[PDB]
Amino acid sequence: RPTFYRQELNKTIWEVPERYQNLSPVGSGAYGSVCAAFDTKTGLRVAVKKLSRPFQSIIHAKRTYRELRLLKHMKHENVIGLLDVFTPARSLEEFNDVYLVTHLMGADLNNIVKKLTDDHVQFLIYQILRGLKYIHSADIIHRDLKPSNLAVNEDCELKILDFGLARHTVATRWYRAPEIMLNWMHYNQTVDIWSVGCIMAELLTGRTLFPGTDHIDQLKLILRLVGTPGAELLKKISSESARNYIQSLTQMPKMNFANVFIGANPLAVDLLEKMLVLDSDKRITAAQALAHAYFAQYHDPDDEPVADPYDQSFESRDLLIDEWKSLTYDEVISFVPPP
Ligand SMILES: O=C(Nc1cc(Nc2ccc3c(c2)OCc2ccc(OCCN4CCOCC4)cc2C3=O)ccc1F)c1ccccc1
Ligand SMILES: CCCCCCCCO[C@@H]1O[C@H](CO)[C@@H](O)[C@H](O)[C@H]1O
Ligand SMILES: CCCCCCCCO[C@@H]1O[C@H](CO)[C@@H](O)[C@H](O)[C@H]1O
Numbered sequence: 522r523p524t525f526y527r528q529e530l531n532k533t534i535w536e537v538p539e540r541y542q543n544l545s546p547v548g549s550g551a552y553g554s555v556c557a558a559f560d561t562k563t564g565l566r567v568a569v570k571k572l573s574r575p576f577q578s579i580i581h582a583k584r585t586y587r588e589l590r591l592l593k594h595m596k597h598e599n600v601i602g603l604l605d606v607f608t609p610a611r612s613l614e615e616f617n618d619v620y621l622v623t624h625l626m627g628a629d630l631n632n633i634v635k636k637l638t639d640d641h642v643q644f645l646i647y648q649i650l651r652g653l654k655y656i657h658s659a660d661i662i663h664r665d666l667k668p669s670n671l672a673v674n675e676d677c678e679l680k681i682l683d684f685g686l687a688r689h690t691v692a693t694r695w696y697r698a699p700e701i702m703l704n705w706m707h708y709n710q711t712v713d714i715w716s717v718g719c720i721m722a723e724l725l726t727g728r729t730l731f732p733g734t735d736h737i738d739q740l741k742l743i744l745r746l747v748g749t750p751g752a753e754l755l756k757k758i759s760s761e762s763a764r765n766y767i768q769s770l771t772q773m774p775k776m777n778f779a780n781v782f783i784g785a786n787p788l789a790v791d792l793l794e795k796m797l798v799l800d801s802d803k804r805i806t807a808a809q810a811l812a813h814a815y816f817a818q819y820h821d822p823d824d825e826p827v828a829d830p831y832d833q834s835f836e837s838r839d840l841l842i843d844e845w846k847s848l849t850y851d852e853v854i855s856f857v858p859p860p
Contacts, residue, residue, distance in 0.1 A: 525609055530556060535571055536609035537620060544569060547625075550669075550687025552584065557625050560604070566625040567604055570684060575619045575849070582845030585619055586835065589852045591683065592621060594659065594831050596859070599652030601672065601680045606856045616850050626680060630668030630720070636727030639786045641677060646721045646792075647819040648679040653717065653807035656681065657710045658827035664708065666716035667696040668723070694736060695729050696720060699743050700801055702736045703763045711804035718796030718804075725785045741770075747799050748775035754800045788815040 523538035531554055535544055544556035553572045560567045575585035592603040605622035609615075630645075637645070649671065656663060663670070669685030698715035700708055722730035731746070733739025749772050750758075758764045778794045779787060792815045795805035805813070811820050835848075 522611075523607075533571060533573070535569075535620075536618065537569060538607060541567065541569060541622070546690045548686045548689040549573075550685060552581075552588075552684060554688075555684075555686065560622075563604075565604075566627075568623045568625045570621045570623070572619040572621070576617055576842055576846050579840070579842050579845065582842045582849070583835075583840070586845045586849040586852065588621070588683070589619065589849055590835070591661070591831075592623075593852060593856060594828070595656075597652055597655040597826065597828070598678070599648045599680055600655055601682045602859065603856070605858060606853050608850075608853055610850075613847055613850050616846060616853075619849065619853065624674075624680070626672035626674040626678070628673050628675075629682070629686060630671040630673060630724075632668075633673070634668065634723070634727070637724045639725070639789065642721065642724040642789065643786075643816060644677055644819060645671075645673065645679055645724060646717065647811065647816045649681065649717055649720065650807045650810045650816075651825055652679070652681040653713050654811060654825055655828050657713065657807055659829065659831035660833060661828075661831055662708060662710050663713045663716075664701070665693065665697075666713050666720065667693060668720060671720070692732070694733055694739050695731055697739070698801065699740055699799055702740055703760065705763075706759070709801050711801045711806060714796050714804045714807060714810065715801070717807075717810070718793055721789065721796070722782070722793055725782060725789055743799070744770065744773050746776050746781065747797055748773045750799055757800075757802075786815065788813075791815070 523540055525536045526539055528535045528544060530544060530546060533554065540562050541558040542561055544558045547555045547557050549555060553570050555568050555570045558567050558569050572585055574581055576582045589606060595602050601623050603621060603623060607620050608618050663683065665683065670682045671679055672682050673679045696716040696719045698712040701712055719730045731739055731742040733742050749770055750767055755768060778790050782790045782793060792810065792813050798804045811825050
């Protein structure tokens with residue numbers, strides 16, 4: 522067991538092993554805060570996330586376990602990976618803090634918002650899709666893919682995060698598939714493809730594709746581009762609510778993408794058409810997307826791995842805070858560094 526040292530940073534205390542030196546806030550947002558640090562053991566710059574109030578409620582407790590489980594499972598170059606997980610706690614009894622350690626990338630994608638070259642886009646989107654392929658094959662939907670959940674280093678290497686930064690040391694709806702806002706019962710994986718579509722579009726135009734002021738506005742903007750649902754899509758809408766609002770709207774046609782994405786690489790345009798289909802069953806999957814001609818210079822089908830099966834059974838479990846806590850504690854304890 523390493524030696525820990527305390528340190529007040531933000532308004533919070535960081536009790537980290539000395540192994541990690543020179544902590545400095547990158548900022549924070551939803552569910553914790555992150556410090557850049559130096560890993561004296563690997564010589565590598567790392568990001569250290571301290572979970573905020575990891576066991577506040579059953580919900581936080583479960584969210585903390587879910588993140589630890591997710592992270593411990595993600596073993597892919599385009600997906601945030603766990604270098605280390607530790608807690609000051611010597612025992613389950615005093616376990617109330619969780620620090621997750623990952624590679625410091627140094628930037629996220631709204632950090633290039635203030636138009637990329639087609640080659641940069643191409644490379645970034647490839648990497649997103651490559652990470653998504655992997656994520657999706659573990660039966661995991663990200664559901665919140667947006668620029669801030671995409672960490673990029675100086676080499677333009679990208680890892681998908683689920684904890685984006687909000688405070689650095691301005692809207693989530695802009696990337697969400699339309700179904701997520703019609704509050705659909707069950708989302709499929711290609712909700713994430715839609716967000717990629719939005720992300721790609723934004724990288725090529727330097728403009729937020731659907732900068733909806735709200736969920737109604739958002740949906741209005743989406744339909745403006747992709748046109749109202751055809752009766753084939755309508756057929757699949759159980760929500761009499763949704764179905765009502767939908768077929769009452771302006772019957773917009775699908776725009777010509779080649780015209781909206783003027784002078785974009787027509788390969789990119791074609792991928793965007795594939796990604797930004799309202800009907801999620803008809804959206805290109807991340808795997809299919811990796812094959813698309815747009816990524817010919819990056820696509821390698823023998824190096825686009827899928828994940829080991831991810832045991833998501835816990836998600837349906839309703840447990841006591843101390844059970845989530847103790848399950849998280851077991852996860853912290855069972856953790857084995859990458860080689
Ligand atoms: O990804 C999940 N959990 C999870 C997320 C993170 N999140 C990270 C990590 C890294 C980074 C980051 C967010 O934000 C983007 C960013 C922005 C700026 C920056 O450096 C800018 C400041 N520099 C410092 C050095 O150079 C001079 C100034 C670095 C980074 C960065 O590198 C960290 C650990 C986790 F554990 C998850 C997964 C599943 C479920 C729930 C959450
Ligand atoms: C490492 C990158 C993978 C991204 C984490 C995917 C999270 C998938 O897990 C999901 O999280 C949702 C919100 O996060 C919850 O509402 C869902 O119940 C849960 O299934
Ligand atoms: C104007 C609102 C139109 C939005 C239509 C969203 C349709 C997304 O696609 C739908 O996803 C469902 C699961 O999420 C699937 O079960 C359906 O097969 C698929 O049609």
